[PDB]
Design an enzyme around this catalytic site. Sequence first.
Site, PDB file in Angstrom:
ATOM      1  N   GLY B  10      22.974-100.424 -48.486  1.00  0.00           N
ATOM      2  CA  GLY B  10      23.672 -99.226 -48.908  1.00  0.00           C
ATOM      3  C   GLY B  10      24.666 -99.492 -50.027  1.00  0.00           C
ATOM      4  O   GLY B  10      25.024-100.630 -50.341  1.00  0.00           O
ATOM      5  N   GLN B  11      25.116 -98.392 -50.636  1.00  0.00           N
ATOM      6  CA  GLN B  11      26.049 -98.471 -51.756  1.00  0.00           C
ATOM      7  C   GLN B  11      27.357 -99.135 -51.346  1.00  0.00           C
ATOM      8  O   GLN B  11      27.863-100.019 -52.047  1.00  0.00           O
ATOM      9  CB  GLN B  11      26.309 -97.067 -52.306  1.00  0.00           C
ATOM     10  CG  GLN B  11      27.098 -97.021 -53.606  1.00  0.00           C
ATOM     11  CD  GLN B  11      28.320 -96.127 -53.508  1.00  0.00           C
ATOM     12  OE1 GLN B  11      29.265 -96.426 -52.780  1.00  0.00           O
ATOM     13  NE2 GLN B  11      28.305 -95.020 -54.241  1.00  0.00           N
ATOM     14  N   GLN B  15      28.768-102.685 -52.802  1.00  0.00           N
ATOM     15  CA  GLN B  15      30.088-102.815 -53.419  1.00  0.00           C
ATOM     16  C   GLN B  15      30.905-103.912 -52.744  1.00  0.00           C
ATOM     17  O   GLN B  15      31.432-104.818 -53.410  1.00  0.00           O
ATOM     18  CB  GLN B  15      30.832-101.481 -53.349  1.00  0.00           C
ATOM     19  CG  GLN B  15      30.629-100.590 -54.558  1.00  0.00           C
ATOM     20  CD  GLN B  15      31.172 -99.192 -54.346  1.00  0.00           C
ATOM     21  OE1 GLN B  15      31.581 -98.832 -53.244  1.00  0.00           O
ATOM     22  NE2 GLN B  15      31.182 -98.395 -55.406  1.00  0.00           N
ATOM     23  N   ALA B  99      17.819 -91.905 -49.169  1.00  0.00           N
ATOM     24  CA  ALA B  99      18.057 -91.110 -47.970  1.00  0.00           C
ATOM     25  C   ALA B  99      18.776 -89.812 -48.297  1.00  0.00           C
ATOM     26  O   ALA B  99      18.526 -88.786 -47.656  1.00  0.00           O
ATOM     27  CB  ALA B  99      18.861 -91.919 -46.953  1.00  0.00           C
ATOM     28  N   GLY B 146      22.628 -96.546 -45.626  1.00  0.00           N
ATOM     29  CA  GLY B 146      23.474 -97.402 -44.812  1.00  0.00           C
ATOM     30  C   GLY B 146      23.318 -97.147 -43.326  1.00  0.00           C
ATOM     31  O   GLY B 146      23.320 -98.082 -42.521  1.00  0.00           O
ATOM     32  N   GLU B 183      28.411 -86.562 -41.662  1.00  0.00           N
ATOM     33  CA  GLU B 183      28.761 -87.946 -41.358  1.00  0.00           C
ATOM     34  C   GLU B 183      28.847 -88.211 -39.856  1.00  0.00           C
ATOM     35  O   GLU B 183      28.384 -89.267 -39.406  1.00  0.00           O
ATOM     36  CB  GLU B 183      30.082 -88.327 -42.031  1.00  0.00           C
ATOM     37  CG  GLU B 183      29.946 -88.684 -43.499  1.00  0.00           C
ATOM     38  CD  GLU B 183      31.287 -88.905 -44.172  1.00  0.00           C
ATOM     39  OE1 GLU B 183      32.327 -88.694 -43.514  1.00  0.00           O
ATOM     40  OE2 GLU B 183      31.301 -89.289 -45.360  1.00  0.00           O
ATOM     41  N   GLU B 254      32.376-119.604 -32.189  1.00  0.00           N
ATOM     42  CA  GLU B 254      33.093-119.808 -30.932  1.00  0.00           C
ATOM     43  C   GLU B 254      34.044-118.662 -30.613  1.00  0.00           C
ATOM     44  O   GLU B 254      34.462-118.528 -29.459  1.00  0.00           O
ATOM     45  CB  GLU B 254      33.882-121.127 -30.936  1.00  0.00           C
ATOM     46  CG  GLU B 254      33.238-122.316 -31.685  1.00  0.00           C
ATOM     47  CD  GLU B 254      33.373-123.665 -30.978  1.00  0.00           C
ATOM     48  OE1 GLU B 254      33.706-123.719 -29.775  1.00  0.00           O
ATOM     49  OE2 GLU B 254      33.139-124.694 -31.646  1.00  0.00           O
TER      50      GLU B 254
HETATM   51  N1  LIG Z   1      35.712 -98.389 -47.573  1.00  0.00           N
HETATM   52  C1  LIG Z   1      34.785 -98.060 -48.466  1.00  0.00           C
HETATM   53  N2  LIG Z   1      33.875 -97.069 -48.177  1.00  0.00           N
HETATM   54  C2  LIG Z   1      32.925 -96.719 -49.071  1.00  0.00           C
HETATM   55  C3  LIG Z   1      32.854 -97.361 -50.293  1.00  0.00           C
HETATM   56  N3  LIG Z   1      31.828 -96.822 -50.981  1.00  0.00           N
HETATM   57  C4  LIG Z   1      31.247 -95.866 -50.222  1.00  0.00           C
HETATM   58  N4  LIG Z   1      31.928 -95.778 -49.036  1.00  0.00           N
HETATM   59  C5  LIG Z   1      31.615 -94.876 -47.905  1.00  0.00           C
HETATM   60  O1  LIG Z   1      30.261 -94.483 -47.991  1.00  0.00           O
HETATM   61  C6  LIG Z   1      30.101 -93.123 -47.648  1.00  0.00           C
HETATM   62  C7  LIG Z   1      29.048 -92.484 -48.534  1.00  0.00           C
HETATM   63  O2  LIG Z   1      27.771 -92.798 -48.046  1.00  0.00           O
HETATM   64  P1  LIG Z   1      27.180 -94.276 -48.245  1.00  0.00           P
HETATM   65  O3  LIG Z   1      27.501 -95.176 -47.079  1.00  0.00           O
HETATM   66  O4  LIG Z   1      27.700 -94.857 -49.534  1.00  0.00           O
HETATM   67  O5  LIG Z   1      25.610 -93.998 -48.385  1.00  0.00           O
HETATM   68  P2  LIG Z   1      24.878 -94.585 -49.681  1.00  0.00           P
HETATM   69  O6  LIG Z   1      25.050 -96.079 -49.734  1.00  0.00           O
HETATM   70  O7  LIG Z   1      25.427 -93.918 -50.917  1.00  0.00           O
HETATM   71  O8  LIG Z   1      23.343 -94.168 -49.483  1.00  0.00           O
HETATM   72  P3  LIG Z   1      22.989 -92.614 -49.649  1.00  0.00           P
HETATM   73  O9  LIG Z   1      23.933 -91.802 -48.798  1.00  0.00           O
HETATM   74  O10 LIG Z   1      21.558 -92.364 -49.240  1.00  0.00           O
HETATM   75  O11 LIG Z   1      23.180 -92.258 -51.102  1.00  0.00           O
HETATM   76  C8  LIG Z   1      31.446 -92.460 -47.841  1.00  0.00           C
HETATM   77  O12 LIG Z   1      31.756 -91.625 -46.753  1.00  0.00           O
HETATM   78  C9  LIG Z   1      32.437 -93.595 -47.927  1.00  0.00           C
HETATM   79  O13 LIG Z   1      33.326 -93.516 -46.844  1.00  0.00           O
HETATM   80  C10 LIG Z   1      33.767 -98.359 -50.597  1.00  0.00           C
HETATM   81  O14 LIG Z   1      33.717 -98.934 -51.679  1.00  0.00           O
HETATM   82  N5  LIG Z   1      34.733 -98.709 -49.679  1.00  0.00           N
HETATM   83 MG   LIG Z   2      23.361 -94.155 -51.402  1.00  0.00          MG
END
Ligand SMILES: Nc1nc2c(ncn2[C@@H]2O[C@H](COP(=O)(O)OP(=O)(O)OP(=O)(O)O)[C@@H](O)[C@H]2O)c(=O)[nH]1
Ligand SMILES: [Mg+2]
Lengths: 418, 440, 430
Positions: B10-11, B15, B99, B146, B183, B254
């Site tokens: 996932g994104q 990151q 997704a 994700g 969510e 451990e």
């Molecule tokens: N803590 C933190 N949360 C992040 C970050 N980037 C994205 N998120 C979380 O990711 C959520 C967005 O959905 P993603 O988990 O990124 O899903 P995705 O990876 O974009 O995959 P798709 O939803 O299909 O596009 C948001 O609600 C954020 O809370 C980050 O850099 N740090």
């Molecule tokens: Mg995504």
Amino acid sequence: KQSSISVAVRVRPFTEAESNRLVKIDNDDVFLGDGCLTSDNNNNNNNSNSNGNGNGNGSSAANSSGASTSRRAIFNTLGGLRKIINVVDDRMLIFDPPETNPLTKMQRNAFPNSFKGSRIREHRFVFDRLFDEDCTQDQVYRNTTQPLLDSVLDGYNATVFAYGATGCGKTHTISGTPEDPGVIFLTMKELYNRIEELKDTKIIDISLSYLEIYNETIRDLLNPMTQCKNLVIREDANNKISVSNLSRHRPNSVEEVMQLILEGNKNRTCSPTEANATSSRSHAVLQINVIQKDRTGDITEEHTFATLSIIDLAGSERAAATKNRGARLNEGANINKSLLALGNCINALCDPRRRNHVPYRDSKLTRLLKFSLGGNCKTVMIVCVSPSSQHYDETLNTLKYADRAKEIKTKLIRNQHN
Amino acid sequence: MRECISIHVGQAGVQIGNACWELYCLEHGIQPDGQMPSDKTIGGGDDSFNTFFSETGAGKHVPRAVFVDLEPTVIDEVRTGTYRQLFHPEQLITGKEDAANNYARGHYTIGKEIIDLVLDRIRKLADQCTGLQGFLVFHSFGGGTGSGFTSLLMERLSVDYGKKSKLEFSIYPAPQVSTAVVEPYNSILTTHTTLEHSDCAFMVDNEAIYDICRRNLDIERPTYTNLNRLISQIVSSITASLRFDGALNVDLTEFQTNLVPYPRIHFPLATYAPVISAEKAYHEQLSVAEITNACFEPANQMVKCDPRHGKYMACCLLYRGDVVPKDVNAAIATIKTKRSIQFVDWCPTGFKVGINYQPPTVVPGGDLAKVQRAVCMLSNTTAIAEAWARLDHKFDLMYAKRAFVHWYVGEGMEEGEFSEAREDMAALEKDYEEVGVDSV
Amino acid sequence: MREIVHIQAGQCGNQIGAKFWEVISDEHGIDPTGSYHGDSDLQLERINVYYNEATGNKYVPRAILVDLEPGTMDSVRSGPFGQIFRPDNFVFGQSGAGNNWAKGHYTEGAELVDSVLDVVRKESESCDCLQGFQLTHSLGGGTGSGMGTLLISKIREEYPDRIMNTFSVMPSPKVSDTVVEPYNATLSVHQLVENTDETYCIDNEALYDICFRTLKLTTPTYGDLNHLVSATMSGVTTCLRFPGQLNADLRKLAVNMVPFPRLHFFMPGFAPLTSRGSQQYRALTVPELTQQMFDSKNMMAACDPRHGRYLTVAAIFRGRMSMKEVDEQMLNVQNKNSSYFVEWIPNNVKTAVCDIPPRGLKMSATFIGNSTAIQELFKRISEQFTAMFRRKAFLHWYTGEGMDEMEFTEAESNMNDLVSEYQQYQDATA
Ligand SMILES: Nc1nc2c(ncn2[C@@H]2O[C@H](COP(=O)(O)OP(=O)(O)OP(=O)(O)O)[C@@H](O)[C@H]2O)c(=O)[nH]1
Ligand SMILES: [Mg+2]
Ligand SMILES: CC[C@H](C)[C@@H]([C@@H](CC(=O)N1CCC[C@H]1[C@H](OC)[C@@H](C)C(=O)N[C@@H](Cc1ccccc1)c1nccs1)OC)N(C)C(=O)[C@@H](NC(=O)[C@H](C(C)C)N(C)C)C(C)C
Ligand SMILES: Nc1ncnc2c1ncn2[C@@H]1O[C@H](COP(=O)(O)OP(=O)(O)NP(=O)(O)O)[C@@H](O)[C@H]1O
Ligand SMILES: Nc1nc2c(ncn2[C@@H]2O[C@H](COP(=O)(O)OP(=O)(O)O)[C@@H](O)[C@H]2O)c(=O)[nH]1
């Protein structure tokens, strides 16, 4: 003059492949294991190999679920009757049977470990009629629809619909097999015999209709070559749902109608891959319209109409197996959306506050069932639920729906005039 | 030796993974162009820091990870980023849809299109690990790919490779930076699928990270770069117990034995208290007796809860930099006198401790001061259950009216899944409630 | 690289397209003759969402003109922008098709819908993905409301795994006074309640009322009623063609603002109000802009949001401005309002920010606010459909082409059910 939808359940008999797995494991535990146990002298608790060579001559081949009770070797799954239905009588059943294994017995008053699992699930379900694994077609017929057909010739309408997930035998329960009849065949034979008995005092005529809701379209199995684009649902200004371009054939002899029904049922799409070649992959609605005409030729002309609806519902298919997704998944997902619409309609209708809306204008099936639920007809359900522990959450969800829809109100006043 | 494998799905995962790989590449003196100075003499072998990286003919230390994301945007950004030569050119480019904020879409429909290649690449990486220890996956509850691609890949790899220790790093969502309203549905469903197959899962609350980045760090509207860096610091703190072999280096594995009573109750918290702004860190230096007492304050947690009212199950302190054993015993004896801290009534076993001799590092141009006496916590509790209750509350408000259900149902999922997952999470909450009962 | 093909049908749809496409080409720095010239490199980030590569650095649009009467083709072929579209983009007949809906739907549509579908297939054969087609029509004259609905009902079958976008210009008695209009709208509306899950309810009544009351123009020309719709829909579709954190693909727009498959009718708005030309207004403070958005005066639907409630109020801000400015008052607006946001949805409001501003105006904003006060639209049409159908006049123009009388009662019952369904959530608290 108030009425009430009644409910009726059917429990599938164990199929051979899982019947062997039942016989290998469940019998000893129920008879002389978990069922009764033994004195403080039993030298072996449950690891005995005298059950058809269920374990090798040595260490256990696989991890046990608990206290060497099950999971004796590596297979696809245990698949025992650890969580099953109990048909104790014909007015009440209990699901999640308590004290089924001794592990539950030690799981009381002890540390709140796996606790509150079965204790919270101590729920007794009180339906109107229940069936056993061993009944045949005549047994279900003799109390599922005989009063209903006694009502239908008098003037009242009536409806029955199947239910439940895949593998529970909805098509066999309703549509019958080439040898074993269904429910429609018996009803038709009894209708013919009642026609003959009531001949020379009242003339009766019958009309047949048959349609399917494949892919949320409409089609007529009694007459192919009618493209689904032409067929649509419409509505008159007095709450009628007459589909356009229905064939609406009329029978004259028993052989003709049964041959035509078989010819129509040949055309339904079905899954040919697995041994479940009976997998109905589309809904189906059959309607029998009966019209009377008095012969006294004087006062008291009880000119009356009536109709009877049989419905077969394709089961809800979850992600369990169902490979080559997309195709199979889309054909499953449209059915899932239709069933979701049906369940939402049921939940909305049963309440006393949301009754002002009662959403029917939804996917096609929830619309075609408009008269069935809250109209004028009497209704009786037939829900097929498998008892095996493999299909557990299927059973729980289907039976929860069965408990729902038991409190429906439908004023009925017949179609009498003059 | 104990070559772990890191997965980012996932994104958010990609990151955090890029930030963490930057941090690890900088800490061990590895240049972004592969080479390093130490291997000019050592060349290679089975040192402590060779657990993650690998060797090759030219000495270019290739990272042990495969990046998974159905959107090719972020994968292109990493490919077009500054680490072009480090990751071998076998990132999982996805030239298809994603997704798109739906667990059902990622799991069933599109997830099966690429899972074979994902398994092939993960097997290629694993087969070079003679002594493969475990998997560290990175995902998010509220996301798209994700939420679901992780929940499928974990099952596939567990069935393929038997029983190997699996670790997941979660990002529990917050309403301040929520990109969606569905969510909660993704979170509950992926927790239902994940609970019975994940050894330990770590809750990195985004609300807590944002609030701490607002109070301690003085930035008012921190973009995702600051949150990425601050979360990468915690990840590095937990993971630094594997790349080194110093004295008192209690292994990462451990810890798991002292953290998870039963295989369903493995959601611990995590705290961190060297965080101070770059321009305000001077004029003071911190002591261990104050650092270790700071971590217990409710203000510096990473899941919003109040352990003071609840009860403590166990504790585990992991220090970094330069700390002498003479001070830690006095610090532990001091904090034990605190009345507000209360242990469960069947385990007074006390605070396990570990120390690693290496100073924490921050990327050049960052914002965190180079404070040497860094400390990290890992302690379960019954107060974490409150978090799940919050999610359950949302499920009570967005399920009496059946909102948004059709989007998930139309992908090939029945309605019965949702009630099953809800009952699963209710069972989790009741289990957390009942463990705190007295021993009488 | 998730592509979209823009099919536009009807004269009004064609003109809205010829305006919106020029607006897009202006924002991304592509002028006529197809070449790139701009003041930043954020423009080429997501050009393939709408436009398409061609030889010689020509960024030809990817859209089809559906127009039966050939007058619109000559109007646009030498219009402001319409001189770059490919020769085969246009599909046309040799008839007008009149205001008779059945003439375009049944007898005339069948002749050319084949060619339109063929060209759509050709366009879908060149890309590598397709989010979902977008339509610009109106619930008005026969040509648009017939051919667009037919294309929807066909391409939905031909590509069921997509989300359909339709831009609907609901007509009012003020802007036109042809009395067969309520019938055409009431019948064409329920052919989109099923086949599309993302539609925008642009209203002509609200547009005329705003262009007569706020802007002091007394002779509102169709060259000045388009300069609100084009700007509003550009603000709506700003997210897709620039990088951003929020919705970057239709399915996201639907999943965030489609609580149920039936209730997908929005009411887009606009914070500033601009006439055509080079006229300008004072600089806008963010709190004033956010306060002005909520009130009914800027709404492009006749309904009053103060009466009902909201469901999803996803909003977009343009231009350069500090992020923390927007999140201060917004939450307070969410707090002071006692009950005008539904409770059983958690976390209703959502916000985003973009960098490149609109043309000329350097500060603006948009929002796609779904509402449960939209019923007043349909509850008005029922009063302009029941009066004519009780005496059932004007039927012989439609009944004498192939359609029955059942379908009209079907449409009326469908509208009544939709109104009741929207009404039920008004007082259905958590
Ligand atoms: N803590 C933190 N949360 C992040 C970050 N980037 C994205 N998120 C979380 O990711 C959520 C967005 O959905 P993603 O988990 O990124 O899903 P995705 O990876 O974009 O995959 P798709 O939803 O299909 O596009 C948001 O609600 C954020 O809370 C980050 O850099 N740090
Ligand atoms: Mg995504
Ligand atoms: C308020 C209702 C309409 C606004 C009004 C407009 C229509 C219009 O402006 N129209 C209808 C096509 C022509 C357009 C303009 O006519 C003035 C034309 C010059 C133009 O510019 N047309 C272009 C727009 C344009 C402008 C600049 C550059 C390029 C293009 C179009 N191409 C295609 C579609 S529109 O007429 C003023 N209409 C319909 C009318 O019928 C008249 N009003 C009434 O009948 C009133 C009602 C309707 C209130 N009755 C109750 C008594 C009107 C003559 C006072
Ligand atoms: N009561 C029963 N007696 C005998 N055989 C049964 C019974 N119930 C089910 N079966 C058998 O179980 C198998 C499955 O039946 P089937 O007709 O596929 O169920 P179905 O639900 O109608 N198919 P599907 O459309 O996928 O749900 C068949 O081989 C039936 O003969
Ligand atoms: N808002 C707006 N509405 C328009 C415009 N032009 C036409 N309409 C509406 O669309 C209807 C005309 O339908 P039209 O597309 O011209 O039918 P056609 O002539 O057969 O192609 C009228 O009832 C108007 O309400 C316009 O420029 N702006």
